[PDB]
Design a protein around this ligand. Structure first.
Ligand SMILES: CCCCCCCC/C=C/CCCCCCCC(=O)OC[C@H](O)CO
Ligand SMILES: CCCCCCCC/C=C\CCCCCCCC(=O)OC[C@H](O)CO
Ligand SMILES: CCCCCCCC/C=C\CCCCCCCC(=O)OC[C@H](O)CO
Ligand SMILES: Nc1ccn([C@@H]2O[C@H](COP(=O)(O)O)[C@@H](O)[C@H]2O)c(=O)n1
Ligand SMILES: CCCCCCCCCCCCCCCCCC
Ligand SMILES: CCCCCCCCCCCCCCCCCC
Ligand SMILES: CCCCCCCCCCCCCCCCCC
Ligand SMILES: O=P([O-])([O-])O[C@H]1[C@@H](O)[C@H](O)[C@@H](O)[C@H](O)[C@@H]1O
Ligand code: NA
Ligand code: NA
Ligand code: NA
Ligand code: NA
Lengths: 336, 336
């Protein structure tokens, strides 16, 4: 029983891509389980949650998971508030004063919602953004507080890159050779996410650098190499499995070369992206295989070879596919 | 609207250094701003200038600066005629008589062009002269090799892939068996074989960007295969684990060293340099393995010193290139 009180605006009457923004916001809010009430003077009906939207907005995210007590924002503009039913016990009639009292009386967090504030002179951007949205949100909502905190405590994006890469190589090269595949997989995954935090951090500094991007990518390569090298050490000298080291060497080399194809193609002004296995799928397959092979109490060892062999084949295919991208890029076959 | 009318000849179908003489003269004339039309009986379309080439000819000049009314010649042989559009008002159907009437009606000048008229019994001399126009031990052994490989229908990319495949096969067949000296010899030979592809591309009046990307990716696959075969032998043949950490370092760091330069150039920065580059890498490792397995005088310590040196030299290199990326223009500028 959640109520969504939306303040009326003349711009809601405007139609965007065949539907009125008033209908568009009504449908998005309803999809999120809200009973929608457009209002001019706020009349609070008894409910468990109150989503109060005061500024005209077009919500671009399909799944709106609202919880706690939050302040909804987008691109720095405060769009609305997510209060509890206890707000009814404070609301006296003046919405500004009631909101200020509720904010002073409670602990609230900001909630970045994928949305844009509407005006008479910005509907082209709203149409473009709705089309982009129709053709991640929670990823941003969990990433931005983390990046904010890391910046506040004095860490720079490149520093976080180095820390995540160093910690991931340390976990891979200490835990994997010892046979501790499950804790190694967990530590490596944690610090791979940590390394990926630098992009959000740089976006919060009004922009990153080209060196920072090159460093992030080279560190990705060092981290992948370390994962596969620790796994290779274990498989070769711990399990004493020669076929599986053939698969591991293939995975190592082809992952390096798969990333290198895209880098070098872009260096030549061509494209080289795509493929079945990219770095996220690569890491997931190999780390899940290792973890399942060493899972506590109910370990299934054949998960390690399977993941390794599958990946290997999927890497070889990928290496070809990316080459095809390079082949099909404009200007790739010019005699220049 | 300049039209070049070239009389069709059977000889134009022959290939000289990978390209047909038809395509070669077509590209040469198009570079000079002509739309090329091959003909048997002349049917004059309205145009600004007319370049009529009746005898089968190989044009050896890159830049053709044609203006006014000229008669193209070489060594006394009449190569072509450069008339104005007014020739359209004189052409009566018989091309020889029309050409003679147009010459009688105008004052023309000779234009000495570097070209050779083709016949069935002078294509060897024509190929030699084309090679001179397009172009150490490289001249006497590499260029004949490229001419030969092109003659039998092989393309530059074909030689790239074949040389890389042969080198990978040598590395992965000979090295794991402990045949380090024969492996070093085979790998060195087929590295040179792969490097023949550049001469082949230069002889086809230009390579491609895809060809360059492929050459680089194949270099990476070759490095990976060399170090993987050596790692296999060292791990299961010599059973030397310290040397396997050194070899793993060499493998990974060679891949990442190349990736750094590629990625920096993708970002518009520089990333080259370092003490140990791919030629020095190959020389050190291939010489160390060969000396360790040399017949009569095999000296085992050459493989570990070459590897450890290499390892230490690679890590440093990886740092140096990163510093290059840091110090390139615009590397640390903020991207709004
Ligand atoms: C797409 C290109 C990928 C390129 C990278 C692929 C990496 C593959 C690694 C192969 C290891 C070689 C295995 C060779 C089998 C060795 C057989 C043998 O004779 O082993 C004897 C042993 O060393 C003493 O007991
Ligand atoms: C600059 C960045 C370059 C990164 C290069 C990475 C090399 C991986 C080498 C992996 C070697 C792993 C050795 C682990 C080991 O020796 O462990 C023995 C013992 O069994 C354990 O419990
Ligand atoms: C750096 C120098 C490394 C020398 C290693 C060495 O001498 O190894 C000999 C043989 O391969 C093993 O006893
Ligand atoms: N497959 C191909 C096609 C063209 N090329 C050309 O040859 C150049 C390098 O020559 P080498 O292979 O002899 O080093 C490349 O940068 C490119 O211009 C090539 O190396 N391989
Ligand atoms: C074990 C792998 C770690 C690789 C580290 C690479 C060093 C990069 C140095 C650049 C640092 C820029 C600013 C640091 C804060
Ligand atoms: C082509 C793929 C080959 C897969 C071979 C599977 C071997 C299983 C032993 C680990
Ligand atoms: C279509 C892309 C091909 C690029 C060259 C790959 C060459 C690798 C071939 C490996 C052959 C293994 C032989 C082992 C015995
Ligand atoms: O941005 P970047 O790191 O240069 O490019 C990388 C990513 O685009 C992709 O997600 C990853 O899976 C590939 O390995 C690729 O190399
Ligand atoms: Na990063
Ligand atoms: Na940076
Ligand atoms: Na990274
Ligand atoms: Na090559």
């Amino acid at each position: 029983m959640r109520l969504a009180y939306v303040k009326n605006h003349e711009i809601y009457g405007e139609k965007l891509l065949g539907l009125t923004l008033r209908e568009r916001i009504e449908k998005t809010l309803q999809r999120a389980g809200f009973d929608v009430r457009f209002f001019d003077e706020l009349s609070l009906e008894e409910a468990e949650d109150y989503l109060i939207i005061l500024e005209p907005v077009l919500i671009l995210e399909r799944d709106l998971l609202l919880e706690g007590r939050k302040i909804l924002v987008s691109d720095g503009f405060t769009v609305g508030y997510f209060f509890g039913g206890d707000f009814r016990t404070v609301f006296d009639g003046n919405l500004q004063s009631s909101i200020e009292k509720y904010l002073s009386l409670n602990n609230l967090e900001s909630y970045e919602i994928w949305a844009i504030k509407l005006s008479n002179d910005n509907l082209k951007t709203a149409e473009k953004l709705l089309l982009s949205s129709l053709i991640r949100a929670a990823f941003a909502r969990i990433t931005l507080p983390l990046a904010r905190a890391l910046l506040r405590i004095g860490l720079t994006p490149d520093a976080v890159t180095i820390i995540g890469t160093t910690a991931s190589v340390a976990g891979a090269l200490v835990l994997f050779p010892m046979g501790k595949l499950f804790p190694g997989a967990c530590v490596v995954w944690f610090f791979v996410l940590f390394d990926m935090l630098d992009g959000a951090m740089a976006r919060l500094r009004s922009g990153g650098t080209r060196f920072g991007a090159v460093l992030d990518a080279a560190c990705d390569r060092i981290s992948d190499g370390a994962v596969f090298s620790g796994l290779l050490w274990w498989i070769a000298f711990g399990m004493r499995d020669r076929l599986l080291v053939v698969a591991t060497l293939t995975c190592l080399v082809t992952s390096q070369v798969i990333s290198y194809i895209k880098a070098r193609a872009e260096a030549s002004g061509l494209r080289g992206d795509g493929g079945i296995i990219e770095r996220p799928e690569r890491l997931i397959i190999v780390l899940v295989g290792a973890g399942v092979s060493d899972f506590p109490f109910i370990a299934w060892p054949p998960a390690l070879p399977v993941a390794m062999w599958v990946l290997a084949v999927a890497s070889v295919i990928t290496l070809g596919q990316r080459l095809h991208t390079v082949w099909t890029s404009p200007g790739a076959t010019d005699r220049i």
